[PDB]
Design a protein that fits this description.
part of a larger assembly, 6 chains, alpha/beta, Helicase, Ruva Protein, domain 3, Ribosomal Protein S5, domain 2, four-stranded mixed sheet, three-stranded parallel sheet, elongated, binds ligand 4KZ, binds phosphothiophosphoric acid-adenylate ester, binds adenosine-5'-diphosphate, hydrolase/protein binding, complete three-dimensional structure, cytosolic protein, HYDROLASE-PROTEIN BINDING complex
């Protein structure tokens, strides 16, 4: 929508407003790069400022030494007209890693990606929770770990990790505050992969609360999370069964690109995400 | 004064206001509490400049040769000033009065802000004048006072125009962060009325009543921060950030 | 001991991180008016080193035989942030492995539990401060090479 | 059917929709932008006795 | 036993490295009023004995 | 205003107080900032229901 607004209404207005008239032109990839790397806002005003900056650069380069006809600004020339890129887009991983899982977040400016990562080291049964986590999210981690302590035979977890293993859950980065209950499952996948030494597929984003007996409860803000998962190149989603009524708010081409799996139990998630053989030696 | 007033310049509504004091003859040689206000009024009326401008150079290569021998460093700030000046010279007629991305100089105290204003004003060969806006909190400090009062005084911009006789000088509105707003008064509405180049051509005062030539009167604003400028003023701006200096 | 770099609003500053490893029972003390983000980054670096205990020649069970103490001079100056992750990783690994760390190399960078180095902020003040104090070697994250211009 | 209010983040078009509605029904368009003072004594004026 | 006719001051680091302090003048005058004639002081504070 | 004070209401003490305030307003000269306060106060006393 921002790319279409910048095509129709914003860029001809800024070009005519700056004095250029058809001696300069941008492409679409340049517009998407400017949006993704120079703009973090819900509205459209900062993008309007950036297109004004590009038109004023072009006017100065016209008044230094003129050219003939039209010059088409590509995506490589945007740092030559705007400077250092001041934001970094989210990248999806590709390899199954052991001890981590791919989660989805939600801001009032758009969803992001977040990565839960868990280390399991020999120790004496202590749980550390770092990364500026609120209280709801710590209690969600404790509920996930108690579910896993109750079901050690079902998943090949060690028989006594409650007093021989120290666990540590970290959510990068360490400076921004993070809160909420919508990542109950992500932590249950990461802790189970870290304890059973088998990798977790990073192709798949996931969300949903967890209860103490293993029910996946519905969550909020699904369209922003799914749009952010589609823009980062992830085509597989795990979602609660009670949120299938909210898939009708998505664009059609986004919904056709995503392979969505609907769950009720946590065991349906752990069967689907973990690779069936261990790769590392165990903890103790 | 009727020698002084029929000279070069003034428009014709100014002339209808100028024929006011022929029959305001005798109240100043004896009394009166409001007699010198009309004397001073037509002094102000013949004092402000009309139809006399300085022809301007807008060459950016002369602008680089002006700026570089007056300041050291600040090269990126120089370049954004050059971009603003290039788009100022390139647009004539339409989209020069619809959009003025008015310069805002933001930085800590101790960096060269006012010196850049004098160097810009000396680059276009025009006549600098600075108006500070430190403790300003009333609209009549920007506008005039009514001439029906005893103490009637026009605003600071009439002073800035009567200093230098160019139609279009360079005026630096220094420290607009410190415009204090409270109950019963803020001159930021008069700032938007005088600052946006689409209603300032119909500007007036409470002292004088005629329109003004505030069309190509070039404006520069300075600030120490952003978060205390009123939001209807934070749409007609274009910020340039001066960070602070290296040891060398 | 390792050499690190800080950011004040009036320029950069060298800071030294020093740690000690004495016989004990596994506690971790963190002194020098440290904020919460900095304590969490120290704990993340220590968990990374407990996981990879054979790659770097660390003792096999230091998690319950060694008390560590992380001190950042000076006191009465509050310090916070997370850019100090690989500095504390270097200092803790040097103290546990009894291998000296080079002090003629400044460094900066945020760490995670997998051992990934994350981007930081305020890079030019830190590099100017490291240059005008006589340090000619910098370790920096790869995703900060955009700001070297 | 009561007073319509337009809610959202800034930057999203909420004034240009108002001009679109005004020009669609051939009215004129103004914009008070209240909140510039700190009293209810600027919506209603003050009399001549002040 | 630690001998008590020596007044001392200084900040310690974890490597055993004495770092400079503030308020040297008032501390030395107070030690000289009380009859102490032996001071231990950091090396980086000899510029402030003047 | 004297007619309006006599017509509506009033309790007796409030009536004598309003009449003394009216005589005080009649003695002074108009346009003074003392007079507008008394005029506003009598305007409030007359148009409140009794
Ligand atoms: B969930 O509640 O929809 C989710 C929680 C969560 C889990 C794991 C990692 C990040 C977030 N919520 C969010 O994403 C929250 C918003 C929220 C919080 C509580 C209740 C409802 C909604 N957002 C964040 O925490 C966030 C967003 N962007 C950056 C950093 N943190
Ligand atoms: B890092 O996050 O960029 C860094 C942390 C740090 C570095 C070296 C020693 C201790 C901590 N942050 C800083 O430079 C902080 C300032 C800061 C904190 C959070 C976000 C941005 C910037 N520096 C200090 O705490 C500090 C203390 N005393 C003097 C100078 N700086
Ligand atoms: N880059 C520079 N090159 C040369 N002289 C400079 C430079 N920056 C500042 N100065 C000098 O520093 C002095 C102070 O400049 P000022 O403009 O008064 O500082 P200032 O920050 O604008 O003050 P305030 O209180 O913030 S308005 C002047 O003599 C300038 O010439
Ligand atoms: N959906 C849209 N289609 C076309 N233009 C838009 C759209 N949304 C915003 N804009 C443009 O962005 C600008 C935002 O200005 P404005 O509506 O004043 O923002 P706000 O309402 O947040 O103050 C408008 O001038 C408008 O031209």
């Amino acid at each position: 929508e921002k790319q279409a607004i910048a095509r129709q209404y914003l860029w001809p207005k800024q070009v005519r407003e700056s004095g250029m008239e058809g001696r300069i032109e941008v492409t679409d990839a340049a517009i998407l790069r400017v949006i993704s790397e120079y703009t973090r806002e819900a509205g459209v005003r900062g993008l309007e400022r950036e297109l004004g900056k590009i038109a004023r650069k072009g006017a100065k380069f016209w008044l230094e030494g003129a050219w003939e006809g039209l010059r088409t600004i590509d995506a490589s020339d945007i740092p030559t007209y705007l400077g250092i890129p001041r934001y970094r887009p989210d990248k999806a991983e590709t390899e199954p890693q052991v001890g981590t899982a791919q989660g989805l977040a939600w801001t009032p400016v758009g969803g992001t990606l977040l990565t839960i990562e868990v280390a399991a080291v020999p120790g004496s049964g202590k749980l550390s929770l770092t990364g500026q986590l609120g209280e709801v999210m710590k209690e969600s981690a404790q509920a996930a770990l108690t579910y896993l302590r109750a079901h050690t035979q079902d998943y090949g977890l060690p028989e006594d990790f409650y007093n021989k293993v120290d666990l540590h859950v970290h959510v990068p980065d360490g400076a921004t505050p993070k809160d909420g209950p919508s990542a109950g499952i992500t932590m249950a996948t990461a802790i189970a992969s870290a304890l059973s030494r088998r990798p977790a597929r990073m192709d798949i984003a996931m969300t949903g609360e967890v209860s103490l007996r293993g029910k996946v409860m519905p969550i909020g803000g699904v369209k922003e999370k799914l749009l952010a998962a589609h823009q980062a190149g992830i085509h597989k989603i795990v979602l609660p069964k009670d949120n299938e009524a909210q898939l009708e708010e998505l664009p059609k081409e986004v919904l056709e690109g995503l392979e969505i799996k609907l769950v009720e139990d946590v065991g349906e998630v752990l069967e689907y995400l973990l690779l069936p053989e261990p790769t590392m030696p165990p903890v103790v | 004064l009727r020698k002084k007033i029929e000279e070069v310049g003034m428009p014709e509504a100014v002339k209808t206001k100028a024929l006011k004091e022929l029959d305001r003859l005798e109240r100043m040689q004896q009394g009166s509490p409001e007699a010198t206000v009309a004397r001073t009024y037509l002094d102000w009326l013949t004092e402000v400049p009309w139809s006399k401008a300085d022809p301007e150079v807008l060459d950016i290569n002369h602008t680089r040769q002006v700026l570089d021998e007056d300041h050291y460093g600040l090269k990126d700030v120089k370049e954004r000033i050059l971009e603003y000046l290039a788009v100022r010279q390139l647009t004539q007629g339409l989209d020069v009065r619809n959009k003025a991305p008015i310069l805002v100089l933001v930085g800590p105290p101790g960096v060269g802000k006012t010196s850049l204003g004098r160097s810009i004003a000396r680059s276009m060969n025009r006549k600098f004048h600075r108006i500070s806006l430190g403790g300003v909190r009333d609209e009549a400090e920007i506008r005039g006072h009514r001439r029906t009062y005893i103490g009637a005084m026009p605003g600071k911009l009439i002073h800035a125009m009567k200093q230098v006789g160019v139609i279009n000088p360079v005026i630096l509105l220094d420290e607009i962060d410190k415009m204090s707003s409270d109950w019963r008064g803020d001159p930021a509405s008069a700032m938007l009325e005088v600052l946006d180049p689409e209603q300032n051509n119909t500007f007036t005062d409470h002292y004088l009543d005629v329109p003004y030539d505030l069309s190509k009167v070039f404006f520069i604003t300075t600030a120490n921060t952003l978060q205390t400028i009123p939001r209807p003023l934070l749409d007609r701006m274009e910020v340039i950030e001066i960070p602070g200096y290296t040891n060398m």
